[PDB]
Design a protein around this ligand. Structure first.
Ligand SMILES: O=Cc1ccccc1O
Ligand SMILES: O=Cc1ccccc1O
Ligand SMILES: O=Cc1ccccc1O
Lengths: 484, 484
């Protein structure tokens, strides 16, 4: 099995207590990766390293930053087969999802690289004579980046590339389910030639995660925090950062809906539905978790959806290829889903395809006639399961979409685009896709949600404000008048 | 004395329990204002009103928004003498500070008004064929705006004008020390012709403030929160908003320094020092609380500073004009200051001018040879007192400025501007003024701080993101390809 260490100051090291933790395969129990198990002591060492490196890193010019980041992308692409292999072992990712993760990661680093000269402020008019008024965008300092296991590569990449190009250094906290992959992405950054202490990598058993996080948030060195993960945990992180008045970029849960109006190209909508629902076993925060369909069209749409869905391949990508539905991440994922499943089913829901789960194994499942009294109506379910909510009319569609506690991604299918736009513009979502799937992300385009999905933004120009100080600076004449 | 009510749905009303609270003068104990004492019930009614009005207000066009806001400014200026009079009675503001507050308030509304057509998104390149990718900036919903008593008018104005032009409605929570002024600013908005429920006004006795705030933050109607006030309270507000994953604009405390290098135009620096230190009795969050001066120059600078400071007029603006040092806000302000004063004085500090306080009455006071072991070294002191920290060299100056737990405003005086810029650019402050005072604010320019000063920003273009939803929207072809 793979062996993985901590990374501080361009050095791969054991934890301060020489202790390890394992990532076992969720169905076979076979050890996939053994990782160094960081302590709080290690975490503080990581922050101190980041702080120290910041002293010179903040002054590195745009040309060098761009060159370095561009190189990271090149290096990540050069390691593509390893990423595919490791992601398949650790998080049951098919070659499709793994390969995409790499492309997306490399592209994030290139987009970030491109932004090097684009982190700009403004020169602003002032009534004051002989005075320059302007804004500057400067580096912040050490950033705490906490990254989950699902968008295994790209979620790390985004949480490194962007703070780097903004002149910051980062303490990267990886996932207990993905330690080989996160060590690997780190290694890529190392081989691109990033200065020592600019990127520091930590991973731990989940029993240690909270206190390691608390120590870093409470650490004077850490200036801002980005967190990607469950709303449940996100609130707790933000509550801690509030005790120290620290800004958070929160990238949390979703219940991303596909709105299928009575007008929809049913062929096209089914395709978007099948894709968005079951890519990476619905373990994407923006996976299509709802299909809100007009009653006039529902029966027909559901029939086609079910036909395609049943035909989808189930299996283990580390054992065999062409798996659409790989295993889930943990021998627990099905336990949560089944609780949601039973509740829905006892309240009138209808299994139109699939069945319940067991550990990390589940067939592609669709529930029809889901209603607002069922937990699964709005509770996020990280798995190859999705729900159909039927509705009557454009207004009720908007209502149902807007009644979610989340607001990450969404899709609206309708042949009348003027109409689709009305609903598209009225719904409370960070991402709206007119006649598109709910699973999209481009680096030029801001990525984030509203409500329980959090706040702040990765990607696009918007990510810059997340990792910069905005300073209002004036240059004034020596002689000026004062009231007293 | 003045009598003040609550404001909900274009209606001035008593609180749900017909209870009142008073603003007594901090030295005479005479009743200045009697205000309706809002209950939690009133607060929820306010949010519901704001939510309901949002339904139509979000769709009001840019032309009408601009016209309306422009009118608010006109209306506020038409009420200038009343503002002067009321602010003098409630918060001991001189005509200088009151008059400025009005101008600044009117200008905020005009700047906000101007921005109506400037709340823009982007059309973004995409690799995808036959696809439009773009960002939209849309309204958020009901905003909770909590406003203190010091920048009595402009701090309210900023917390209304901006959320309004962004298409939001607001629950405005005013200050217990400034209920007549905050009711007045509300009245101005009413007379400009804002639709019912777009602005709703609440005030209460301080014993009720926390729970009224908690109810509003926990309220489903309230989408985002801006808070201006003490770091102490700001953390608590943010902790509450974290429990509901709500974004905060935090505008908190400061220990704003004036850096006087060995190079400085001492005449010019003294003038900036005198102004920034003692405007409105140093009750501005950006009041000059530190004078970091080079030892080579300190003795001379301190001598001039003391000369000017002693000559400053003390008195009560509601009784007599030309008062530079009015009374402080509460018969308690001096109790906090004296604790800070004694500590400094017992640890070697030197009163070069002034003396201790009593209730809300204090002479202009300067302490010299303040060192890092004294509480007053970095603790904010809301009063006509300020401290001198001596230093040796450009590096040590930056260190001392950067060692504050706050980072709101700052000034750097030096005849070599290249040098002044080095320190100016290296210090961790939201506002840096090269050869300028620490007390500046223009509506075109972003206003905010780093660290314990909070996060987020009023004024400038930056304020727009605070009160808008940023949505990534795509318009895609019907026919497109999917991997599975
Ligand atoms: O929802 C999680 C996610 C978002 C963007 C890219 C990859 C991902 O797994
Ligand atoms: O406290 C809320 C909040 C708002 C914007 C950014 C970071 C935050 O923690
Ligand atoms: O520090 C408080 C403040 C900031 C901007 C304008 C007026 C004020 O009182």
């Amino acid at each position: 099995h793979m062996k993985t260490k901590l990374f501080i100051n361009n050095a791969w090291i054991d934890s301060s207590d020489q202790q390890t933790f394992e990532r076992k395969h969720p169905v076979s129990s076979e050890v996939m990766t053994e990782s160094a198990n960081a302590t709080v002591t290690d975490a503080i060492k990581a922050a101190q390293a980041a702080e120290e490196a910041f002293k010179t890193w903040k002054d590195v010019g745009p040309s060098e930053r761009r060159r370095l980041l561009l190189k990271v992308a090149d290096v990540m692409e050069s390691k593509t087969p390893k990423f595919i292999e490791v992601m398949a072992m650790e998080v049951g990712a098919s070659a499709l999802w793994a390969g995409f993760n790499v492309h997306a990661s490399a592209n994030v680093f290139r987009e970030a690289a491109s932004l090097a000269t684009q982190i700009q402020g403004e020169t602003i008019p002032t009534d004051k004579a002989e005075t320059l008024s302007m804004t500057l965008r400067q580096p912040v300092g050490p950033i705490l980046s906490i990254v989950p296991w699902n968008g295994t590569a790209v979620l790390a990449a985004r949480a490194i590339a962007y703070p780097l190009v903004c002149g910051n250094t980062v303490v990267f906290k990886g996932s207990e389910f993905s330690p080989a992959t996160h060590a690997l992405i780190t290694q890529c950054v190392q081989e691109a030639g990033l200065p020592a202490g600019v990127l520091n990598y930590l991973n731990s058993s989940p029993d240690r995660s909270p206190e390691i996080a608390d120590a870093l948030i409470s650490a004077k060195e850490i200036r801002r925090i980005n967190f990607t993960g469950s709303t449940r945990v996100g609130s707790i992180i933000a509550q801690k950062a509030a005790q120290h008045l620290k800004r958070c970029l929160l990238e949390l849960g979703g219940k991303s809906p596909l709105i299928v109006l009575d007008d929809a190209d049913i062929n096209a909508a089914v395709k978007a539905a099948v894709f968005g629902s079951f890519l990476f076993q619905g373990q994407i925060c923006m996976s299509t978790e709802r299909l809100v369909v007009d009653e006039k069209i529902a029966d027909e749409f559901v029939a086609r959806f079910v036909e395609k869905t049943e035909r989808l391949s189930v299996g283990d990508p580390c054992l065999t290829g062409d798996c659409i539905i790989g295993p889930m991440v943990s021998p627990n994922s099905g336990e949560r889903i089944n609780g949601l499943f039973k509740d829905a089913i006892d309240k009138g829901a209808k299994v139109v395809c699939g069945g319940m789960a067991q550990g990390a194994v589940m067939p592609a499942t669709i529930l029809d006639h889901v209603k607002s009294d069922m937990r699964i109506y709005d509770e996020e379910t990280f798995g190859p399961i999705t729900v159909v909510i039927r509705c009557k009319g454009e207004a009720e569609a908007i209502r149902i979409a807007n009644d979610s506690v989340y607001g990450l991604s969404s899709g609206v299918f309708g042949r009348d685009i003027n109409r689709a736009l009305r609903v598209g513009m009225s719904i409370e979502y960070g991402c709206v896709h007119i006649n598109g799937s709910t699973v999209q992300n481009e680096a030029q385009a801001p990525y984030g949600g509203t409500k329980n999905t959090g706040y702040g933004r990765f990607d696009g120009r918007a990510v810059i404000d997340e990792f910069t100080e905005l300073k209002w600076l004036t240059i004034e004449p020596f002689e000026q008048q004062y009231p007293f």
